[PDB]
Design an enzyme around this catalytic site. Structure first.
Site, PDB file in Angstrom:
ATOM      1  CB  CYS A   1       2.578   0.036   7.470  1.00  0.00           C
ATOM      2  SG  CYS A   1       0.874   0.121   7.967  1.00  0.00           S
TER       3      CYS A   1
ATOM      4  CG  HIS B   1      -0.614   0.003   2.485  1.00  0.00           C
ATOM      5  ND1 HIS B   1       0.001   1.084   3.070  1.00  0.00           N
ATOM      6  CD2 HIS B   1      -0.702  -0.939   3.447  1.00  0.00           C
ATOM      7  CE1 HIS B   1       0.281   0.808   4.334  1.00  0.00           C
ATOM      8  NE2 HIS B   1      -0.130  -0.421   4.587  1.00  0.00           N
TER       9      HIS B   1
ATOM     10  N   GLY C   1       2.182   5.466  10.294  1.00  0.00           N
ATOM     11  CA  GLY C   1       3.572   5.311   9.931  1.00  0.00           C
ATOM     12  C   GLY C   1       4.221   4.031  10.409  1.00  0.00           C
TER      13      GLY C   1
HETATM   14  C1  YDL Z   1       0.595   1.828   8.332  1.00  0.00           C
HETATM   15  N1  YDL Z   1       1.385   2.794   8.550  1.00  0.00           N
HETATM   16  C2  YDL Z   1      -0.828   1.981   8.865  1.00  0.00           C
HETATM   17  C3  YDL Z   1      -0.945   1.457  10.282  1.00  0.00           C
HETATM   18  C4  YDL Z   1      -2.341   1.882  10.975  1.00  0.00           C
HETATM   19  C5  YDL Z   1      -2.361   3.195  11.139  1.00  0.00           C
HETATM   20  C6  YDL Z   1      -3.282   3.475  12.522  1.00  0.00           C
HETATM   21  N2  YDL Z   1      -2.930   2.465  13.359  1.00  0.00           N
HETATM   22  C7  YDL Z   1      -2.306   1.312  12.477  1.00  0.00           C
HETATM   23  O1  YDL Z   1      -1.895   0.263  12.815  1.00  0.00           O
HETATM   24  N3  YDL Z   1      -1.713   1.232   7.962  1.00  0.00           N
HETATM   25  C8  YDL Z   1      -2.830   1.846   7.273  1.00  0.00           C
HETATM   26  O2  YDL Z   1      -3.087   3.005   7.461  1.00  0.00           O
HETATM   27  C9  YDL Z   1      -3.596   1.031   6.383  1.00  0.00           C
HETATM   28  C10 YDL Z   1      -3.357   1.392   4.865  1.00  0.00           C
HETATM   29  C11 YDL Z   1      -4.562   1.433   4.269  1.00  0.00           C
HETATM   30  C12 YDL Z   1      -4.987   0.044   3.664  1.00  0.00           C
HETATM   31  F1  YDL Z   1      -4.998  -0.930   4.639  1.00  0.00           F
HETATM   32  F2  YDL Z   1      -4.122  -0.302   2.687  1.00  0.00           F
HETATM   33  F3  YDL Z   1      -6.249   0.121   3.134  1.00  0.00           F
HETATM   34  C13 YDL Z   1      -5.608   1.850   5.483  1.00  0.00           C
HETATM   35  N4  YDL Z   1      -5.071   1.343   6.636  1.00  0.00           N
HETATM   36  C14 YDL Z   1      -5.729   1.099   7.901  1.00  0.00           C
HETATM   37  O3  YDL Z   1      -5.066   0.622   8.784  1.00  0.00           O
HETATM   38  C15 YDL Z   1      -7.206   1.470   8.058  1.00  0.00           C
HETATM   39  N5  YDL Z   1      -7.851   0.329   8.607  1.00  0.00           N
HETATM   40  C16 YDL Z   1      -8.931  -0.311   7.869  1.00  0.00           C
HETATM   41  O4  YDL Z   1      -9.330   0.182   6.831  1.00  0.00           O
HETATM   42  O5  YDL Z   1      -9.477  -1.483   8.386  1.00  0.00           O
HETATM   43  C17 YDL Z   1     -10.490  -1.992   7.533  1.00  0.00           C
HETATM   44  C18 YDL Z   1      -7.301   2.727   8.972  1.00  0.00           C
HETATM   45  C19 YDL Z   1      -6.807   2.456  10.388  1.00  0.00           C
HETATM   46  C20 YDL Z   1      -8.796   3.191   8.999  1.00  0.00           C
HETATM   47  C21 YDL Z   1      -6.438   3.869   8.349  1.00  0.00           C
END
Ligand code: YDL
Ligand code: YDL
Lengths: 304, 304
Positions: free
Chosen positions: A148, A41, A146
Site C-alpha cells: 500500500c 489505514h 506491504g
Molecule cells: C497494503 N499494504 C495492503 C495491500 C493488500 C495486501 C494483499 N494484497 C493487497 O493488495 N492493504 C490492506 O491490507 C488493506 C488494509 C485493510 C483495510 F483496507 F484498511 F481495511 C485490509 N486490506 C485489504 O486489502 C483486505 N481486503 C478487503 O478487506 O477487501 C474488502 C485484505 C486483502 C483481506 C487484507
C-alpha cells in the site's frame, strides 16, 4: 513496429517514494514538495481493521506518531511537522522539501484509461506494470502485503499526473486504491469487510484501438464491408458485457491512417466476441482491451 | 495476489543511457564506468547498410568521429578517448566515469528467459516492458526508428545483469539485438537484407509456471489425475511446436506449494493446446508462455 504492454520509465517516481510507519504498521508514501501522502489505514491496529474509526484514530496521533524514511537514492529521515486526513489518505507535512519533486498534477482516471504502477515494499520500488481502470472501478494488479502506498501515474511530456495510491485487494488479483483527492476508486471502504463488486466488462474503445493496431501490423482478416452504427452497437454492448463506445480524436486518427471505419470494427466485435474459431489476432484468441487508442498511436506511429 | 507483466524499476538504468552520434547517424548507448557501448551500425551510412564493411568503417573513424551526450539527469558531453569493436557492438572509452554506475554483470539469456527492456530515443528513456527470449532467438518488442542501443536486463538483488542491446527489426513486431560480448541473438547479421527466422514455439516450462499461477489464484479446472512423463511430453512437444521441458528448482517449489505434479500439467497442456473450448485460465483462452517460474514465485509468494 510491435505492440506490447508498456509502462513509463519509473525513475522520476522512484525518487519520490518513502516508507511511512505508524506504530506497528508500515507502508509506502509519496513525497512531493513538503508533503508525504499515504493511506490512512497506516493508523489502524490490525485488531480494528474490520471497524475503524478514522476520525478517532487521527486525533489520537501527534506528529511524532509517524516516522518517514527515504531508503533509496538520497537517504534521509524526514521530520513530520503536520498531519491531516483527506478522504482515505493522510497528508503529512515534512520539514524538508523533496529536491527531486517532478512537475506534476493530480488527476482521477476513468474506466478504460491506462496508467503505470510502481509497486514498492518498505519504501523500495520492486516492479512496474501498466493497468487499465476496469469498468467496475477495480484494477487487475499484482500486489502483496506491504504494497500500500504504491502509486499509479500517467505522463504528459515531463509532467507526471498521479492518479492512484494502492489501498486494498478486494478479491484474487483484484485491487483498488485512492485518487489524490482521497476518494477511493469504486467508493470501496478502507475497512476489512467483504464488499461486492460490479461485474467487469470489456472496454469497447480499447478493443477498437487494438483491432486498429492489428490492421497496422498486417492483420485484417476480420475486416469486412459490414458496419454497425455506434448507437446500435451501444444497445448491443449493454446486453453483452461491453462498455458503450465513445469515439475520440485518437480513434479517428487510427481510422484515417488505416482507412477502416470505426463502424466496421464494431461489427467485427459483434462477430468475434463469441470466439475467433481457431484464428488469431496479434497472437491472441480473445479480444484485448488493455491497449488504449493513445497507447496504440504512440507505440506504432510515434504520435502523441 | 494477481499475476501481471512486470518489469524492474528502470531508474538505475535510466542513469546510464546516453546518445551516441557518428556523422548523420544517431542512436543510444550504455555508459558504465569509462565505457560507452552502442551498436556498430551507427558507423554505417544509410546507402551502405545492405552490404557494410565494418572493419573498413572502423579504421575510417577517429575518436572525434563519435559524439556522446547525456541528456537526462546529470547532463554532460563525454569526450571519446578510445574506440574499439567487439562483434556487433562498439566500445567507446570516455574520459569521465559514470558516477551512477550500478553493480552489474553481463549475461547471455536463453529461450524462455524474461528480461526488462528500457526503450530509449535520442538518449531519452520513453518506456519499459518485459520480453521473453523466443525459441527462435527473437523478441516480440515495440521499437521504432532510433531505438537501437536500448537495453535489456535482469536484476539479482541490487546487481543489474545486462543481457541485450537492441539492433534490428526482422519482421513486424519481431526484433533482435546483441549480448554484451557482441554476439547477435540468433546470429542474425547487422546488414539490411532479409534473413529467415525459425518458427516460434511455445515455451513449455513457462506454460507450466502459468498453470501453477492459475492454481494459486483459485483456477484448477484443468487439473486431472492423468499424467504425462517429461520424456513422453518432450517427444510430443517436438511434433507440436512446443519446446522440450526442463524442470528446475523454481518449478519444483510451485509443485510443492500446490501439490500438483509437473506431469499432471504436462498432460493438461496436451489437452489445452487445441483450445480451451469456451473456458478460460487467468482471463485467457490460450496458453500463456511469457511468465517464468521465477516470475511466478516472486509475484505470488514473494520468494526469490
Ligand atoms: C497494503 N499494504 C495492503 C495491500 C493488500 C495486501 C494483499 N494484497 C493487497 O493488495 N492493504 C490492506 O491490507 C488493506 C488494509 C485493510 C483495510 F483496507 F484498511 F481495511 C485490509 N486490506 C485489504 O486489502 C483486505 N481486503 C478487503 O478487506 O477487501 C474488502 C485484505 C486483502 C483481506 C487484507
Ligand atoms: C535502430 N535504431 C533500428 C531499430 C529498428 C528500426 C524499426 N524498428 C526497429 O526495431 N535498427 C535498424 O534500423 C537496423 C540497422 C540496419 C542494420 F541492421 F544494421 F542493417 C537496418 N536495420 C533494421 O532493423 C532493418 N531490418 C532488417 O534488415 O532485417 C533483416 C529494417 C527494419 C528494415 C530497417
Amino acid at each position: 513496429s510491435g505492440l506490447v504492454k508498456m509502462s513509463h520509465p519509473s525513475g522520476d517516481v522512484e525518487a519520490c517514494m518513502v516508507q511511512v510507519t505508524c506504530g506497528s504498521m508500515t507502508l509506502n508514501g509519496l513525497w512531493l514538495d513538503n508533503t508525504v501522502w499515504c493511506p490512512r489505514h497506516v493508523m489502524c491496529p490490525a485488531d480494528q481493521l474490520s471497524d475503524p474509526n478514522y476520525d478517532a484514530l487521527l486525533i489520537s496521533m501527534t506528529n511524532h506518531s509517524f516516522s518517514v524514511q527515504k531508503h533509496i537514492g538520497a537517504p534521509a529521515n524526514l521530520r513530520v511537522v503536520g498531519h491531516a486526513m483527506q478522504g482515505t489518505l493522510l497528508k503529512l507535512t515534512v520539514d524538508v522539501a523533496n529536491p527531486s519533486t517532478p512537475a506534476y498534477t493530480f488527476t482521477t482516471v476513468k474506466p478504460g484509461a491506462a496508467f503505470s504502477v510502481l509497486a514498492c515494499y518498505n519504501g523500495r520500488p520492486t516492479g512496474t506494470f501498466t493497468v487499465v481502470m476496469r469498468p467496475n472501478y477495480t484494477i487487475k494488479g499484482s500486489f502483496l502485503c506491504g504494497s500500500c502506498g504504491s502509486v499509479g501515474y500517467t505522463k504528459e511530456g515531463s509532467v507526471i499526473n498521479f492518479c492512484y495510491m494502492h489501498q486494498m485487494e478486494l478479491a484474487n488479483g483484484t485491487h483498488t486504491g485512492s485518487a489524490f483527492d482521497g476518494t477511493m476508486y469504486g467508493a470501496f471502504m478502507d475497512k476489512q469487510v467483504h464488499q461486492v463488486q460490479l461485474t467487469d466488462k470489456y472496454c469497447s474503445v480499447n478493443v477498437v484501438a487494438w483491432l486498429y493496431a492489428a490492421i497496422l501490423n498486417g492483420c485484417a482478416w476480420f475486416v469486412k464491408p459490414n458496419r454497425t452504427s455506434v448507437v446500435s452497437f451501444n444497445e448491443w454492448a449493454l446486453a453483452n458485457q461491453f462498455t458503450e463506445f465513445v469515439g475520440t480524436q485518437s480513434v479517428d486518427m487510427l481510422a484515417v491512417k488505416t482507412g477502416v471505419a470505426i463502424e466496421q470494427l464494431l461489427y467485427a466485435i459483434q462477430q468475434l466476441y463469441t470466439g475467433f474459431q481457431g484464428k488469431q489476432i496479434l497472437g491472441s484468441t480473445m479480444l484485448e482491451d488493455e491497449f488504449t487508442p493513445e497507447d496504440v498511436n504512440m507505440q506504432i506511429m510515434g504520435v502523441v
